[PDB]
């Protein structure tokens, strides 16, 4: 019996199956647990006080480090490629090369600007970034219980890192899997480290001591693949935030996610399950 799953925001297509998965995670305990979470609109809020909260892309796109001309080119890239991303009549494989182009073109553009490492903190300090209510309990509980948290984003990892750092919850159990800026010795942006992470490879292959049990947190249908690449996953619980277009997407989300949290700007349910799992061996 999990009290937290009775919150008004909770939707479960198969509650009996959910209680089976939760009971399996309970028996594994913290020793076998890892959390794999998207960032934008999952750990960060969708809206606050009737106003939409920015994505990590918005924080960069509206920032003062980006010039007028560069912002115009980034906008033209979006008007070109975003309709491809959301085209209902194309398969993933018919969107994949264009998303790779979109990301490569945007990164190449950022590298033509004179971005310096210290400017990222300034961009975040002035932004309206907000984490979901209960983030202190979420990050603090994972850290004190030695639970690895992998945060996935196809955006800029330095931006995510500075948001969490400035909220005083960047504990060493946090591992951000994203596109990190590559700075030269002078501190100027010259490229991006590692392999490109775009919207279709935001999964664990971009990244363990018996971490067979997974809690997955996301807000998009694409986020369901984030744990793909984790070897020997014995149990997985997928929790999805349904923030927008609720009537159109509710049945889809309930079919795909084990637990759906509808218009819930808190981590209350995730924190309750975490406490339930960790407290029972
Ligand atoms: N607002 C905004 N959104 C973008 C942009 C953008 O320019 N502006 N771009 C292009 C871009 C790529 C790399 C950059 F460094 C950059 F500055 C711009 C991608 N997206 C979104 O990224 C989500 C997947 O990533 P996530 O899984 O992490 O949410 C997808 O739904 C995309 O619509
Ligand atoms: Mg997201």
Residue numbers in the entry: 4 to 210, 219 to 292
Sentences from the paper on this structure:
5’-Cytosolic nucleotidase IIIB (cN-IIIB) is one of the most recently discovered 5’-nucleotidases and has several unique structural and functional features. However, one of the most preferred cN-IIIB substrates is m7GMP, for which the activity of dephosphorylation is characterized by one order of magnitude lower KM constant compared to the other preferred substrates, whereas kcat/KM is comparable.
In the structure of cN-IIIB in complex with 3,4-diF-Bn7GMP (5d), each moiety of the inhibitor is stabilized by direct contact with various protein residues. The 3,4-difluorobenzyl group of the modified base is accommodated in a hydrophobic cavity formed by sidechains of Trp105, Trp106, Tyr 60, Ala109, Leu63, Leu77, Leu113, and Ile159. Then, the guanine base intercalates between the off-centered π-ring system of Tyr 60 and Trp105 separated by typical stacking distances of 3.6 Å between the side chains and the base. The phosphate group is placed in a binding cavity in the vicinity of amine group of Lys205 and amide group of Ala157, which are in direct contact with phosphate oxygens. Additional hydrogen bonds via structural water molecule with hydroxyl residue of Ser156 and hydrogen bond of Tyr60 with 5’-O-oxygen support the stabilizing contact of phosphate group with nucleotidase and simultaneously distance it from the catalytic center by 2.7 Å. The observed shift of the phosphate center away from the catalytic site may explain why the compound does not undergo dephosphorylation despite tight binding to the protein. The differences between solved structures: the holoenzyme of cN-IIIB • Mg2+, and the enzyme in complex with inhibitors: 5d or 5d’, concern mainly two helices of the CAP domain, which move slightly down and left towards HAD domain by about 3 Å. All the above suggest that ligand 5d freezes the protein conformation in an open state of the enzyme.
